Amino acid sequence: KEAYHFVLVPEELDNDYWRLVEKGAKAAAKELGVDLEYIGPRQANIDEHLRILKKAAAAKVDGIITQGLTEAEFVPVINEITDKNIPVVTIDTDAPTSRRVAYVGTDNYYAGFLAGRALAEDTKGKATVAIITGSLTAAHQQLRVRGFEDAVRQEKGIRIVAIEESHITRVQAAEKAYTILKKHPDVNAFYGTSALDAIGVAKVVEQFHREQKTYIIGFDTLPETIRYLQKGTIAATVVQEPYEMGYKAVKMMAEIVAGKDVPVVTNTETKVIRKKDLPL
Template sequence: MKRTAIIYTLLLASFVFVFAFAIYFYNQVQSYDAKIKKNADTSSPSAYHFALIGEEMDHVYWRLVGEGAKEKEGEYDVFVEYEGPKRSNPEEQLKLLDMAVKSKVDGIIVQALNDKFTPLINQAVDQGIPVMTVDTDAPESRRVAYIGTDNYEAGRLAGETLVKDTKGKATVGIITGRFANAHHQLRIEGFKDVLKQTDGIEIVAVEESNIDRIGAEEQAYKMLREHPDITAFYGTSTLDGGGITAAAEKLNRLDDLYVITFDLSDENAQLLQNGAIDALVEQQPYQMGSRSVEIMMDIIKGKPVEEIHHTDATIIRKPDLLYQKSQAGETS
């Protein structure tokens, strides 16, 4: 009898506990729902919605472009929807551009890698959506403005630097991101135009890395095996420098090669400090993103804007890197 009473007591206690917990859980859910509703009622969407379509989300350069644009959101009451392929893929970029047009965003900022972007840019403009190009221009389209490096002049700058540093005597291999990408074409064109004026310099091979570090390494390795007389390399994208130096190290050629490439990424900065890379063409991706939002706001408000906005390109060598570190309070 006592045992039955104990069982009933335990069952009753369990029921009371479960019932009390159910009431507590219900009240917590109701409180959470009320908070969500309150936030939804009190929050207001941004006044403007811009689409920023970059080349590659996982690329340090494009992360900086995105960060620069997002930094302006609060100042201009704008939401910047930053999208791009995980890896460089022009066809995927075109799909994102098409989606932005169909979503009827207030403005589009896009890297226009080739001629296929022109019809979609024009379609957006026809629908009343202003378009800017960033990093790579589409001058034949009806985009309102372009912001980015003057890639032809950046190529000339790289060429002038190589001529100066090698004293006009070099056999050169070029690794470019993609043959089809307009900004890489311009970087090669400017570079070649300078080297044509120097009798002691010859370009013996040009290959593409597909904007991939391993691709750059494979192409540089192949070049060095086929052209053992190469004394200098020019890389037109951020990842080319790491690939070139990796290939040179495998062939024990690191100490006798001159290497110039683009962008002060963490890896390139380390290679520059170690002497594996001799010079970098530094761009301003953060400024590109930041200024693109400012310019797009001027366009939307009907203010006059210049068609071309060039950001600076400069040469960085090891002493410049050490100076930057000292300015930031770091020890070299």
């Protein structure tokens, strides 16, 4: 009996969030006697991401765990991998129209919906919102935006005046905040859907001395996010369970190759945390 060899491809190797996924994935792998190879782009890059997927598939590994990041490029690659009878578990971002066997990650539509609810609650239903999103093509970003929009649609005192892409860098989130605040000086609320968006926004808001008049809600728990939350510049952030999705993704791949029944979608929890919830 040879050990199962699984590949987990993170969006970015050196990233606090994915290192938490790696920890959970390696904990489950060790617990099951599974060889887990954790490889991806050192810096997020779609083309090296796809290239590492197709390489792992050509190695006849027993299963591949990955984001279904974009419909256009990742659904074909997931299906291509599935056509070699290698099962794919999606993690963090689903591709529900692909032939991936199972998904483990946040309900991204509903993370954004809870963010809309939290913004409406905290602003007492009155806000002029700008949205910073990592990209318009990444499936989880799209869902987080759409969920927020649906949540606030009937909030008569809320209107969304801008949506801008950060390309998941802190510097470009700041850039877009400079552009938005210049163009829409009535903006008193920012919603960021990737891990550095609120952080980039927070810097610009503080530069213009607008923190006391600006509500900021972002995603995840990076150190600068916790700092701005303790300081008051960021009012809230949506917290995921990267360790748990790493752990559950590996355990579910093992169930799949063992022939057991597994659900198609497993959603790890999501929570809107504010300053009062710190420490985590």
